[PDB]
Amino acid sequence: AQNPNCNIMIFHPTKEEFNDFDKYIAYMESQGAHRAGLAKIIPPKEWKARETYDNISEILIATPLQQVASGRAGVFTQYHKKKKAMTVGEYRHLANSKKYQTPPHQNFEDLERKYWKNRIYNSPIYGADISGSLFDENTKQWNLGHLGTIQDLLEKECGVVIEGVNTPYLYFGMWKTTFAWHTEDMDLYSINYLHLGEPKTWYVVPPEHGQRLERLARELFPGSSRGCGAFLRHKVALISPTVLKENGIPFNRITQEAGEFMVTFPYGYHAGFNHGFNCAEAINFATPRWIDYGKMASQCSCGEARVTFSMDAFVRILQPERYDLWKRGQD
Numbered sequence: 603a604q605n606p607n608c609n610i611m612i613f614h615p616t617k618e619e620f621n622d623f624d625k626y627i628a629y630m631e632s633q634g635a636h637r638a639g640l641a642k643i644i645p646p647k648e649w650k651a652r653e654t655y656d657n658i659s660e661i662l663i664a665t666p667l668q669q670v671a672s673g674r675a676g677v678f679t680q681y682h683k684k685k686k687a688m689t690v691g692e693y694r695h696l697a698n699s700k701k702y703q704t705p706p707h708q709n710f711e712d713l714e715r716k717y718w719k720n721r722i723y724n725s726p727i728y729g730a731d732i733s734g735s736l737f738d739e740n741t742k743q744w745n746l747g748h749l750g751t752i753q754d755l756l757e758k759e760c761g762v763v764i765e766g767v768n769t770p771y772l773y774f775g776m777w778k779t780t781f782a783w784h785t786e787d788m789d790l791y792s793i794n795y796l797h798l799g800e801p802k803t804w805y806v807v808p809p810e811h812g813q814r815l816e817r818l819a820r821e822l823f824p825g826s827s828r829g830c831g832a833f834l835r836h837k838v839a840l841i842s843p844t845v846l847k848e849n850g851i852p853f854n855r856i857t858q859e860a861g862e863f864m865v866t867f868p869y870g871y872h873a874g875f876n877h878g879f880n881c882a883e884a885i886n887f888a889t890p891r892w893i894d895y896g897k898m899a900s901q902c903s904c905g906e907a908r909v910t911f912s913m914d915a916f917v918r919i920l921q922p923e924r925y926d927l928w929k930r931g932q933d
């Protein structure tokens with residue numbers, strides 16, 4: 603069995619290997635990369651996403667989100683308070699202000715320590731989930747707006763044509779902006795490209811051990827767990843590496859830098875934080891190996907998770923027994 607300890611693997615494809623996206627994902631899986639839940643892909647030196655980032659300041663962040671924490675430093679939830687619209691140039695200035703800028707630090711490990719010590723005492727503002735793309739249309743390799751769609755994959759594997767679309771999203775971050783513990787909708791893959799700026803630290807639980815994280819989360823968030831049998835779908839709970847280690851939960855960590863891709867694999871729980879002002883692009887995708895995970899994915903039906911239009915067909919076709927309850931939660 604390849605990668606039996608479920609370590610995060612780092613790949614360096616050549617320019618020839620960077621042509622065929624599906625083939626390279628399957629290659630990484632042949633080497634056991636999915637066992638970690640997360641892999642890093644460093645593009646060949648010949649590749650670029652676009653020519654420059656000099657002209658992005660007028661992008662609008664219609665609904666910036668202030669991430670307010672409750673709990674203790676290692677075990678907390680966050681809610682998202684909506685703020686007034688601002689441009690990416692305005693948001694960048696805000697991120698660099700004395701109130702929000704990254705503190706002085708020695709290295710990524712010192713900054714990680716500072717994040718976990720101090721996160722709860724601040725409320726950073728995240729420009730998340732903005733439909734759009736920063737890949738140039740002429741970039742033919744690993745262009746996150748030109749991937750094969752999940753609807754086409756379902757149709758190819760199962761024969762059923764469905765409605766829905768699959769487009770990328772932009773994330774503008776600052777110091778301490780946080781992504782809560784989650785797997786993707788319908789336990790899909792994700793791919794995330796860090797276009798510019800400061801790093802993103804990731805934590806990940808191997809898919810084979812996801813239920814250990816879920817059991818811990820029910821213990822640590824007992825009100826939330828009574829409210830919903832899949833409350834991590836709400837994407838609000840944080841648990842620190844120290845707390846995971848104290849509770850014996852298998853996990854790994856890695857820091858993504860600008861110019862690097864990360865892939866999350868089906869049912870790979872992940873969480874993390876941004877080091878300072880940055881911009882990422884991410885999208886969900888599927889492969890044949892996903893279908894079995896999609897059929898078994900948990901679902902939130904309490905009303906909180908509320909998701910895209912395109913998840914309807916995935917539930918309806920893959921999970922017909924659950925569909926009526928799930929759809930009630932959507933309405």
Ligand SMILES: O=C(O)CNC(=O)C(=O)O
Binds near residue numbers: 793794885
């Ligand atoms: O970058 C972020 O805030 C969160 N991204 C992801 O969870 C992802 O790419 O799957």
Ligand SMILES: [Mg+2]
Binds near residue numbers: 657660661
């Ligand atoms: Mg612009």
Ligand code: NI
Binds near residue numbers: 784785786792866872
């Ligand atoms: Ni994710």
Ligand SMILES: [Zn+2]
Binds near residue numbers: 831
């Ligand atoms: Zn729920």
